[PDB]
Design an enzyme around this catalytic site. Structure first.
Site, PDB file in Angstrom:
ATOM      1  N   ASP A 140       8.802  10.914   4.237  1.00  0.00           N
ATOM      2  CA  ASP A 140       9.178   9.645   4.861  1.00  0.00           C
ATOM      3  C   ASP A 140      10.082   9.952   6.052  1.00  0.00           C
ATOM      4  O   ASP A 140      10.290  11.117   6.410  1.00  0.00           O
ATOM      5  CB  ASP A 140       9.857   8.709   3.866  1.00  0.00           C
ATOM      6  CG  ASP A 140       9.523   7.260   4.125  1.00  0.00           C
ATOM      7  OD1 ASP A 140       9.555   6.837   5.307  1.00  0.00           O
ATOM      8  OD2 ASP A 140       9.200   6.541   3.157  1.00  0.00           O
TER       9      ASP A 140
ATOM     10  N   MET B 136       4.447   4.072  -0.553  1.00  0.00           N
ATOM     11  CA  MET B 136       4.678   5.255  -1.366  1.00  0.00           C
ATOM     12  C   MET B 136       4.156   6.540  -0.733  1.00  0.00           C
ATOM     13  O   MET B 136       4.520   7.627  -1.195  1.00  0.00           O
ATOM     14  CB  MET B 136       4.051   5.062  -2.752  1.00  0.00           C
ATOM     15  CG  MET B 136       4.705   5.888  -3.840  1.00  0.00           C
ATOM     16  SD  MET B 136       4.104   5.467  -5.483  1.00  0.00           S
ATOM     17  CE  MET B 136       4.977   6.688  -6.475  1.00  0.00           C
ATOM     18  N   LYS B 137       3.341   6.440   0.315  1.00  0.00           N
ATOM     19  CA  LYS B 137       2.775   7.588   1.027  1.00  0.00           C
ATOM     20  C   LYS B 137       2.278   8.663   0.058  1.00  0.00           C
ATOM     21  O   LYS B 137       2.585   9.850   0.175  1.00  0.00           O
ATOM     22  CB  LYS B 137       3.792   8.151   2.010  1.00  0.00           C
ATOM     23  CG  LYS B 137       4.609   7.069   2.713  1.00  0.00           C
ATOM     24  CD  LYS B 137       5.511   7.666   3.784  1.00  0.00           C
ATOM     25  CE  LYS B 137       6.187   6.591   4.619  1.00  0.00           C
ATOM     26  NZ  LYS B 137       7.060   5.709   3.782  1.00  0.00           N
ATOM     27  N   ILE B 138       1.447   8.228  -0.889  1.00  0.00           N
ATOM     28  CA  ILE B 138       1.015   9.109  -1.959  1.00  0.00           C
ATOM     29  C   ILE B 138       0.034  10.140  -1.417  1.00  0.00           C
ATOM     30  O   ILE B 138      -0.720   9.885  -0.468  1.00  0.00           O
ATOM     31  CB  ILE B 138       0.391   8.284  -3.099  1.00  0.00           C
ATOM     32  CG1 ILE B 138      -0.802   7.478  -2.578  1.00  0.00           C
ATOM     33  CG2 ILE B 138       1.423   7.352  -3.715  1.00  0.00           C
ATOM     34  CD1 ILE B 138      -1.520   6.718  -3.656  1.00  0.00           C
ATOM     35  N   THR B 162       0.448   2.756   0.805  1.00  0.00           N
ATOM     36  CA  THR B 162       0.313   3.710   1.899  1.00  0.00           C
ATOM     37  C   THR B 162      -0.070   5.079   1.352  1.00  0.00           C
ATOM     38  O   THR B 162       0.341   5.469   0.257  1.00  0.00           O
ATOM     39  CB  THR B 162       1.598   3.832   2.736  1.00  0.00           C
ATOM     40  OG1 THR B 162       2.709   4.179   1.894  1.00  0.00           O
ATOM     41  CG2 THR B 162       1.890   2.543   3.485  1.00  0.00           C
TER      42      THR B 162
END
Ligand SMILES: O=c1ccn([C@@H]2O[C@H](COP(=O)(O)O)[C@@H](O)[C@H]2O)c(=O)[nH]1
Ligand SMILES: O=c1ccn([C@@H]2O[C@H](COP(=O)(O)O)[C@@H](O)[C@H]2O)c(=O)[nH]1
Lengths: 318, 320
Positions: A140, B136-138, B162
Site C-alpha cells: 500500500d 485489500m490489494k490481495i 482491489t
C-alpha cells in the site's frame, strides 16, 4: 536481530527447511473428526506441552478437556479445533524446522476467530523461540502500510513478512523501519513467484534488457542499504519460486549473500535437488525451502517433515 | 450484480463520490474523547437508526448506553468506540456516497477486534444497500487466493475488492468467479498507484515500448472477457491514481467503457476537476472518486462530504 536468530537455530538443527502452516477448512474438519474418533489423542498431547499455558487468547477454552468442548461451548468448537490443529503440527514437526511460515490468507476467511488463532500460533512459536515468517505479501502507500507493520511486528511479534513492492519500493520505509521506536525489521520481497503465468510481468517486462524480477531485486537491496538493515542484523530478501531454476542461479550469483525464500516443492511439483543447489549458500539459512501442504496434509506430519529434513540435509553435503 | 447495483444508486443520488472509511488510532481516541465531553451526542444518534440492529458481531455490546461501557466493560471500550466512529461517519455522509471503500489495513492492526468492526461495517452498509469496496490489494497463488474470495465475498458480502495481479493474471480466476457456486464478483486491479515512487515499476518497465501499467490493464480486461463477468453484471476495473493525468486519459480512451477507481484527491494533493475530466464517462459510476481523510478527519464530515459532492456534480455538468 533476525539474522542472529536465524543463524543460531541453523547451528542448532543444521537445516534450512521452512515449514508452512496454512490450514484450510477441510484440514480442520479432518482434524476434528479424527480426534473425535480416536479419543482426542493429539489434543491431550497438546495440553501436556509447556508453552500452551502461555498463549494470550482464550486460554480458558483452549486448555479444557475436548469432551467438554463439544457438549458445553458449542460456539467455540471451531476456534478450539482450529487452534489445536496448528499446535499439533507445530508440536509434531518443529524439531525439523528452521522457521515456520504462516500465510495470512488462511487465517482471515472466517472473520476474527482465525486471527485469534493466528495470534496464538505466533505466541506459541515466539515462546519456542522458532523464527517466524508471515506470508501476507503486503502492499500500500506509506501511511496505510504502517498498519501492516504494527500488526506483523508489534502485535504478532513476527520476525519477518513478505512484501510486494510493485506499487513502489518506498513502502519498505514504513515496513522495515519504525522511526518512532528506532526499530528495524526483516522482509522478503516478491521476485519470482510460483504462479504458472508469473512470467507475464516478472519476465516479459523489461528495462535496459534487464528483466523485471532483476530490476525489482536490485531496487529491494538499494532500499535495504538506505534503511541500514544489515548493520542492525535485519535484511530485505527475495521470494524466488522453486521452479525458477535459471533465475534462482541468476539471483544467487550477483546477489551473493542475499536471503532467499523459496516455495513450490511438494504440493506444486518440484525438484528439491535442483532448487537447493541453485540457491545454495554456506550460510544456508539464506536459502529457505518452504514445504507446506506436503507436510500439513500428510497423515503422519512428523514423518513427512523428517523426510524433507533428511533430503535437504543430504543435498547440503556438497 | 455490481454493475446494476452501481447504476441503480447513481440514478438515485447522481454522483460518483466514493467515501473512504479508513479510521486510524487517533481517530478512535479523538472520537472517544469528544463523545466523553459532549454527553455522547453522536453515539446516541447512532443507536436510534434503523439498521444498527442488522450488525452481527457483539450487538449486545454495541447497543448498550455508552454510560455503561466506561464503568463496567472496559475491556470492550475500544471495540465500542471504534465501531461507533464508523457508524457515525456512515450516518453523517452516506447520503452523498455512491460507494464506500474500506481499506483492510486499518482494521487489522489491533488483532481480531478490528475484524469484528469491519464485519459490522459491511453488515451495516449491506443493509443500507450502499455499494462497497474492500481495498485489500490481495495477491497470491490460486489455491491461497480462494480464501480471500471467501472472506471478501462470502463473509463480508462486499461488492468488490482491489487486486494486485503482478504475480499473475490467473489469480483473478479464483477471485472474480466461484466455480462451485457459479457466482461472479467484481474487482479493481492496480494500474497506477499514488505512491510518489510508483513510476519506477508501473512506468519505467515496458514491453515493446508499451508501459507496464498498459500491459497490466489489458491483461486485466482479457481475463474479464474470459470469465464472462460483464454478462453476469460484474466487471474487472482499474485503480488509477488521481495525479496520473496522462495515464488517466490514456485508459479512458483506449479502454472506453472500463470502470475506474481513482484515489488521491484531498489528503494527497489533487486537482479534482482535471482528474474527473480526464476520466469522465456518461455512466460516471465508471469513474469513482475516492475521498478519505479529507472527510473522515474533517471536524464536520457531513459538510465536507457535501462539499466534494457539490464539487463533483458541478464538474459533471461541464462535461456535457
Ligand atoms: O510465489 C509464491 C509465494 C508464496 N507462496 C505461498 O507459499 C505457500 C506454499 O505452500 P505449499 O504450496 O507447500 O502448500 C502458500 O502459503 C503460498 O501462498 C507460494 O506458494 N508461491
Ligand atoms: O494507489 C493507491 C491505491 C489505494 N489507495 C488507498 O486509497 C485510500 C486513500 O485515502 P485518502 O488519501 O483519501 O485518505 C487509502 O485507503 C489508500 O490505501 C491509495 O491511496 N493509492
Amino acid at each position: 536481530g533476525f539474522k542472529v536468530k536465524l543463524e543460531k537455530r541453523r547451528n542448532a538443527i543444521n537445516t534450512c527447511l521452512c515449514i508452512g502452516l496454512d490450514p484450510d477448512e477441510k484440514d480442520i474438519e479432518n482434524f476434528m473428526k479424527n480426534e473425535k474418533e480416536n479419543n482426542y489423542n493429539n489434543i491431550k498431547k497438546n495440553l501436556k506441552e509447556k508453552y500452551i499455558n502461555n498463549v494470550s487468547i482464550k486460554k480458558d477454552i483452549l486448555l479444557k478437556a475436548p469432551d467438554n468442548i463439544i457438549r458445553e461451548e458449542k460456539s467455540e468448537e471451531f476456534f478450539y479445533f482450529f487452534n489445536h490443529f496448528c499446535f499439533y503440527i507445530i508440536n509434531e514437526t518443529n524439531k525439523y524446522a528452521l522457521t515456520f511460515k504462516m500465510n495470512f490468507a488462511f487465517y482471515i476467511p472466517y472473520g476474527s476467530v482465525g486471527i485469534d488463532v493466528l495470534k496464538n500460533v505466533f505466541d506459541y512459536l515466539y515462546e519456542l523461540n522458532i523464527p517466524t515468517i508471515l506470508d501476507m505479501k503486503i502492499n500500500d502507500i506509506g501511511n496505510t502500510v504502517k498498519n501492516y507493520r504494527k500488526f506483523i511486528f508489534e502485535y504478532l511479534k513476527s520476525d519477518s513478512c513478505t512484501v510486494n513492492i510493485y506499487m513502489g519500493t518506498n513502502m519498505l520505509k514504513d515496513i522495515c523501519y519504525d522511526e518512532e521506536k528506532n526499530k528495524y525489521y526483516s522482509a522478503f520481497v516478491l521476485v519470482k513467484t510460483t504462479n504458472p503465468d508469473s512470467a507475464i510481468f516478472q519476465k516479459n517486462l523489461s528495462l535496459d534488457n534487464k528483466q523485471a524480477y532483476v530490476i525489482m531485486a536490485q531496487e529491494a537491496l538499494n532500499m535495504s542499504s538506505y534503511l541500514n538493515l544489515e548493520q542492525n542484523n535485519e535484511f530485505i530478501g527475495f521470494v524466488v519460486g522453486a521452479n525458477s531454476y535459471d533465475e534462482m542461479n541468476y539471483i544467487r550469483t550477483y546477489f551473493p549473500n542475499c536471503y532467499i525464500l523459496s516455495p513450490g516443492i511438494g504440493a506444486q511439483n518440484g525438484d528439491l535437488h535442483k532448487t537447493l543447489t541453485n540457491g545454495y549458500h554456506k550460510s544456508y539459512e539464506k536459502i529457505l525451502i518452504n514445504i507446506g501442504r506436503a507436510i500439513t496434509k500428510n497423515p503422519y506430519p512428523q514423518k513427512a517433515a523428517q523426510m524433507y529434513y533428511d533430503q535437504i540435509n543430504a543435498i547440503l553435503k556438497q
